Design a protein around this nucleic acid. Structure first.
Ligand SMILES: *O[C@H]1[C@@H](O)[C@H](n2cnc3c(=O)[nH]c(N)nc32)O[C@@H]1COP(=O)(O)OP(=O)(O)OP(=O)(O)O
Lengths: 923, 334
DNA sequence: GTATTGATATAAGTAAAAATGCATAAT
DNA sequence: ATTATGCATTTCCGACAATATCAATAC
RNA sequence: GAAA
């Protein structure tokens, strides 16, 4: 029963509202069915398939996957039950030590209580589902890694208990060691049970041989002289797992919603009705969760809630015509566009004679490895497309919703990972808006501009874009009439499926005589050009940056990437004087794509090898040289770095200031926290991470730390894993290299959220891809106005100065490390005080003791009693004598320094208001 | 009639790239007498010798002064070493080439492309009577080259298409200990298995007495190695070095299956065979339990096994109908 | 005796050394 | 005190990234 | 694969 066609057929607004209310009331049970959990859904599906197979006589191979899974679950549950009983018996007594086997029982005493909480069938189904999910992952040809599988199974069992506990709530965390032990135990039990039936050919008889073989096996492999514990999956299982019944076997748990998403009112409330999702995507960090909870308590994040709710309130549906074309292409079987093409098994060249050249043998092995990698990649890229198309089939002609989350920086992503609008061009062309808004007098122009942009000509003026679209009317007509079995003009665009959808809409418009009153559902994109550079220019007040990133109004849209490519080509013309062959080969071979990636990444702190790889990746299709073109790419990086260093100055100044501030924060120690003894010597722990807040009040905590990888004795093997549940010193290099990009990305996210909230207040349909915002064709002018106003409001204040003030406030009493030679009179005074304080303390006073004395002295002046404060001021500690001095940074022994941050660079006097009429700020 | 480089001359060299060289003519005479190549090669005047990584060239000069071979060639591409070799050995029948012995194409371009060095192919029933190769691989990071040359012995492709080419190699003490480890010893590894399968190796000399405990006492007694102090090797910051002589032998197994079986069995080198066959595929444990009737085999660790037992296991692996594919043993990294 | 953290070897061409991209730390 | 020396812009999607054996210590 |  299609609903989109009925919604379009209804001609009255009141009747449309009535139908929407009826649909919303009707979809509650369907939403409950969709949000039904994986264990129950899988168990019922497998039991139903087993019952149907038992009814239909004996049919094994047809439903082989589900029948085999039910058989394995049924015959492997008793093993788990018996192990639980054994654990209970070995824990009920709780009397003896060194009981049983040293390896066996001492492990059971560790992982026993974590196995008695959850249902045995629940662990069985969880393990089966995880091992089916993680196939051909980790470089293993036909299997998973043991280190991956033990954690994923254990983490899944931990997660299901958290959901069950909170459900009963309407114990903190499990250790990584316990996760590994549980995963290994259950995976071993599944290995002992999983049997498949295969037939092979006897080498000496040349006839078929029958027998039963284990489905899963544990083995090891090598990569560059290092072991690799792996788990393999038999071919008889791989052929079915990579089939078209994978969706039925493994039901998804995060699908598009049918009813309107629950609004965000709390950091742990929103999104799905029955699934609890945190506002942030915290990989492994309790500090971020703590700060997010504190912000939610304070209530300083409400514009974030408004923006996320506006993002999640937009209704979608599946484009039927594009879906049909995609289905025909997929069912044809031949590789079309970016779908690779269905191939069954590998094809390998014939091996050379064994006594051939070792170089020849190495070349053959390299070719075999390349072929296998290509085959596996194609199979994975085809399985992903099959999964997306099956979801599209499931949700065809139905209203959709996409609740959104945030990552630790602040950028927004949908909750559904499989099918959403952040996918590739097929996924972006397979989705349209549920509400169809009249094109009006500007929808035609904006839709034509949208098609011109989707054909890659998004650097031309708007008149040129509409001229292109109106010149290609016949091609648009042919493409929309017969996409397949036609001229296939839409395929030439860099976004073919989106161009196909736009062509469908444009033809349906052109078929009438009054295009103004046409009802359109195709979203139109308007994205900024060089968003990071625009934010840098706004931060620095750079008039030159603003005028070259289209902030200053101009007749034509500039392109920094093309400008840089042209300048580098002129530099290569200069180098043609010397005329070295390496320069001569690539003199005219520059491409704005290579220059674009390098110029974009430069302001975020890219290094030589990173730029080399970025250039080589986009220079490979040009095929200028062999795979040793790394020399050419390195020369390219050298001169493009010279050019960008010449061009961008204020952005690099702000980047340097941010990096220096990150260094100062990373090399600091707290007073009260680090006052306790560490017994490490003169090396106190660095427990401080760079933290700041967006203009919207969201607190961002950088989670970079140091990871300790130790072997954990599990049943299958000893995995090499780390503990993300323990405090570790902050990675200074990671913090310093991450702050400059994270700040800019947080600014981008905040501006996007402000625009989304304002568009929700103004009653538009808003969808966004980070720096790109989508809406209807007739609302593009209003959207542009909203974006310009939000950008002006966001950058009206001095954001860098506010950040510096926040850093100064949050790091008032912190201690840095510094080394100054005693040749200076001031620096020798610190050494004398250290000697003098050591005698006063009566022992060899250390850096920890000196810092503790300074912290305790501060407590006196902070005490309410003036007598204590007078003594504190009277008492002179090691750091107190250095408070006034601010020039000894450059003027031997290591001495304690206070935390002082660098002065902000000068900002050019540029009025950000001038972009209120800039036509090409976003396009 | 050929000058011998002195300690003062060889001490002027700047970089040795981690390669330790020996400069004592007395111990050179001692090791040559111990080797007794005068009997193996009936016509020293009709002997063609290839030298890899010569360095100082003292050993090459003494070899020429002692035997007067038909042809001798030095392959050395390192800058200062080649410069000193040209300075000290020009005007002598010794030949020095600016080629790097690591590249596989070097030997082809030297033998069948430029037609400079051509060995004499003979039957495989005896050691190659008209071809000898000498190498000095002492750099601690260049053990992979030694293992590659052993694999080339296995494949009969690099220099062993000519026949049973006798090998004279200077190696670090740890490498010699690992290659010359007997069954049950703590240092036995797949390198030891390869050495036992493909070659017949003896320890001609060593540079440290305290490192002999790594070798078997019986083997030490049989070999009677020549010992000398570390003062006779010029770069004195390195670990002790050893000299071995490798004689290729005949074998009757398939190299690819044997390599696969040994590599996947000796990962777990202290675990009895009744629990390690499960790592060779699906059903390996039950298949090998059914196909093996021996008693101590199911309780012997692969470090206790020998080449004959490994050949028996690889033949059973061949006879396995449900065997895995050897080729698909790698990762999709790059 | 049992128990524990650290050192060492694995494979073997996408070398190691010497000479660099580069900053940070160290023996 | 310049020598070694680990690492190479950020984020998300499942998006990763070694294991075995031993050799003295500690209890 | 998606974005800076
Ligand atoms: O084109 C990709 C894609 O189909 C797939 N692939 C590779 N890595 C991922 C990943 O993290 N997530 C998803 N969903 N798909 C992935 O394999 C193809 C091959 O990719 P390449 O290795 O050529 O390029 P890569 O993505 O590594 O490029 P970059 O992001 O480092 O620039």
């Amino acid at each position: 029963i299609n609903f989109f066609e009925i919604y379009n057929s209804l001609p009255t607004l009141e009747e449309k509202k009535a139908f929407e209310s009826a649909l919303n009331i009707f979809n509650q049970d369907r939403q409950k069915v969709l949000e039904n959990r994986a264990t129950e859904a899988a168990r019922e599906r497998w039991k139903h398939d087993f019952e149907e197979a038992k009814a239909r006589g004996d049919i094994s191979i047809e439903k082989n996957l589900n029948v085999k899974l039910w058989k394995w679950y049924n015959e492997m549950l008793p093993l788990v039950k018996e192990e639980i009983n054994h654990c209970r018996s070995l824990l009920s007594e709780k009397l003896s030590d060194k009981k049983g086997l040293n390896k066996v029982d001492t492990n059971r005493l560790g992982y026993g209580p974590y196995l008695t909480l959850i249902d045995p069938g629940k662990m069985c189904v969880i393990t089966i589902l995880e091992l089916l999910k993680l196939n051909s992952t980790g470089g293993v040809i036909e299997g998973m890694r043991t280190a991956r599988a033990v954690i994923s199974v254990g983490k899944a069992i931990e997660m299901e208990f958290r959901s069950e506990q909170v459900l009963k709530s309407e114990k903190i965390l499990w250790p990584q060691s316990i996760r590994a032990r549980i995963g290994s135990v259950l995976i071993s039990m599944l290995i002992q049970v999983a049997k498949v039936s295969v037939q092979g050919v006897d080498p000496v008889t040349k006839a078929k041989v029958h027998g039963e073989a284990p489905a899963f096996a544990h083995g090891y492999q090598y990569h560059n002289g290092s072991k690799l514990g792996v788990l393999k999956i038999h071919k008889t299982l791989i052929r079915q797992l990579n089939g078209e019944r994978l969706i039925a076997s493994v039901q998804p748990q995060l699908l598009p919603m049918l009813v309107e998403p629950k609004p965000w009112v709390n950091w742990r409330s929103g999104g799905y009705h029955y699934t609890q999702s945190t506002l942030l995507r915290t990989k492994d960090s309790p500090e971020q969760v703590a700060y997010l909870k504190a912000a939610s308590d304070n209530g300083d994040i409400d514009r974030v809630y408004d923006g996320l709710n506006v993002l999640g309130r937009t209704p979608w549906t599946v484009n039927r015509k594009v879906f049909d074309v995609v289905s025909q292409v997929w069912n044809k079987g031949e590789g079309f566009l970016d779908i690779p093409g269905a191939q069954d098994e590998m094809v390998l060249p014939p091996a050379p004679p064994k006594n051939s050249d070792p170089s020849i043998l190495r070349a053959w092995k390299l070719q075999v490895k390349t072929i296998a990698n290509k085959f596996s990649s194609d199979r994975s890229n085809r399985c992903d497309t099959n999964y997306k198309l099956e979801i599209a089939r499931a949700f065809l002609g139905e209203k959709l919703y996409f609740p959104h989350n945030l990552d630790f920086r602040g950028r927004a992503y949908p909750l559904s990972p499989h099918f959403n609008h952040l996918g590739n061009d097929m996924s972006r062309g397979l989705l349209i808006f549920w509400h169809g808004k009249k094109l009006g007098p500007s929808g035609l122009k904006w839709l034509k501009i949208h098609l011109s942009n989707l054909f890659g000509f998004d650097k031309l003026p708007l008149k040129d874009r509409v001229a292109f679209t109106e010149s290609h009317l016949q091609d648009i007509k042919d493409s929309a009439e017969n996409p397949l079995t036609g001229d296939r003009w839409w395929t030439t665009a860099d976004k073919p499926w989106q161009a196909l959808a736009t062509c469908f809409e444009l033809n349906e418009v052109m078929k009438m005589d009054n295009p103004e009153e046409f009802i359109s559902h195709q979203p139109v994109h308007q994205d900024g050009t060089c968003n990071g550079l625009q934010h840098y220019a706004a931060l620095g007040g750079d008039v030159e940056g603003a005028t070259q990133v289209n902030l200053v109004p101009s007749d034509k849209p500039q392109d920094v990437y093309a400008h840089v490519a042209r300048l580098v080509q002129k530099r290569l013309e200069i180098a043609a004087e010397k005329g070295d062959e390496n320069a001569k080969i690539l003199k005219d071979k520059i491409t704005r794509k290579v220059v674009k990636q390098t110029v974009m990444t430069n302001v975020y702190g890219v290094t030589y090898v990173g730029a080399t790889f970025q250039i080589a990746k986009q220079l490979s299709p040009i095929f200028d040289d062999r795979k040793e073109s790394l020399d050419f790419s390195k020369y390219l990086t050298k001169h493009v770095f010279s050019a960008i260093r010449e061009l961008f100055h204020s952005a690099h100044l702000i980047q340097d200031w941010l990096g220096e501030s990150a260094k100062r924060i990373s090399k600091s120690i707290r007073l009260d926290v680090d006052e306790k003894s560490f017994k490490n010597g003169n090396k106190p722990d660095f427990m401080s991470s760079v933290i700041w807040t967006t203009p919207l009040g969201l607190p961002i905590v950088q989670p970079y730390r140091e990871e300790s990888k130790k072997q954990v004795e599990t049943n299958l093997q000893t995995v090499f894993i780390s503990d993300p549940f323990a405090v570790n010193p902050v990675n200074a290099r990671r913090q310093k290299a991450g702050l400059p990009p994270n700040f800019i990305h947080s600014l981008d996210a905040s501006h996007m959220l402000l625009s989304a909230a304002e568009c929700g207040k103004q009653g538009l349909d808003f969808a966004s891809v980070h720096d790109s915002y989508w809406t209807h064709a007739s609302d593009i002018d209003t959207m542009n106005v909203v974006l310009r106003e939000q950008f002006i409001k966001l950058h009206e204040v001095d954001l860098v100065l506010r950040l510096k003030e926040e850093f100064d406030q949050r790091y008032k009493n912190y201690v840095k490390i510094g080394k100054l030679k005693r040749s200076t009179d001031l620096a020798q005074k610190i050494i004398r005080i250290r000697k003098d304080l050591s005698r006063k303390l009566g022992r060899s006073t250390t850096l920890a003791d000196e810092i503790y004395f300074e912290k305790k002295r501060q407590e006196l002046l902070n005490s309410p009693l003036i007598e204590d404060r007078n003594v504190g001021e009277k008492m002179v500690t090691t750091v107190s004598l250095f408070e006034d001095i601010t020039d000894l940074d450059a003027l031997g022994m290591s001495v304690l320094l206070p935390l002082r941050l660098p002065e902000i660079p000068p900002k050019g006097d540029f009025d950000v208001t001038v972009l209120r009429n800039s036509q090409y700020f976003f396009s | 009639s050929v000058p011998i480089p002195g300690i003062k001359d060889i001490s002027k060299l700047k970089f040795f790239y981690g390669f330790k060289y020996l400069w004592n003519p007395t111990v050179y005479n001692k090791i040559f007498d111990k080797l007794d190549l005068t009997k193996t090669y009936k016509h020293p005047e009709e002997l063609k010798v290839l030298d890899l990584y010569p360095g100082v060239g003292i050993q090459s000069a003494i070899f020429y002064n002692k035997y007067c071979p038909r042809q001798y060639s030095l392959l050395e591409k390192r800058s200062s070493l080649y410069k000193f070799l040209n300075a000290k050995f020009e005007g002598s029948p010794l030949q020095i080439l600016k080629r790097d012995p690591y590249d596989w194409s070097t030997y082809s371009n030297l033998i069948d492309e430029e037609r400079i060095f051509v060995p004499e192919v003979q039957s495989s029933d005896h050691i190659n009577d008209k071809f000898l190769t000498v190498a000095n691989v002492t750099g601690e990071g260049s053990e992979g080259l030694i293992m590659q040359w052993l694999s080339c012995i296995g494949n009969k492709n690099w220099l062993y298409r000519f026949g049973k080419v006798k090998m004279l190699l200077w190696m670090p003490s740890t490498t010699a200990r690992k290659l010359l480890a007997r069954p049950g010893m703590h240092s036995r590894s797949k390198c030891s298995v390869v050495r036992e399968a493909f070659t017949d190796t003896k320890l001609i000399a060593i540079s440290d007495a305290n490192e002999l405990k790594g070798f078997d006492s019986q083997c030490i007694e049989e070999w009677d190695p020549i010992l000398f102090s570390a003062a006779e090797i010029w770069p004195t910051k390195g670990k002790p070095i050893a000299l071995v002589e490798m004689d290729p032998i005949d074998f009757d197994f398939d190299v690819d299956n044997w390599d696969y079986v040994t590599r996947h069995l000796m990962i777990l080198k202290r675990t009895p065979l009744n629990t390690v066959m499960d790592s060779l595929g699906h059903g390996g444990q039950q298949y090998f339990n059914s196909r093996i009737t021996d008693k101590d085999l199911l309780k012997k660790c692969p470090i206790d096994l020998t080449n004959d037992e490994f050949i028996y296991l690889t033949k059973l692996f061949m006879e396995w109908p449900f065997k895995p594919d050897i080729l698909m043993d790698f990762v999709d990294m790059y």
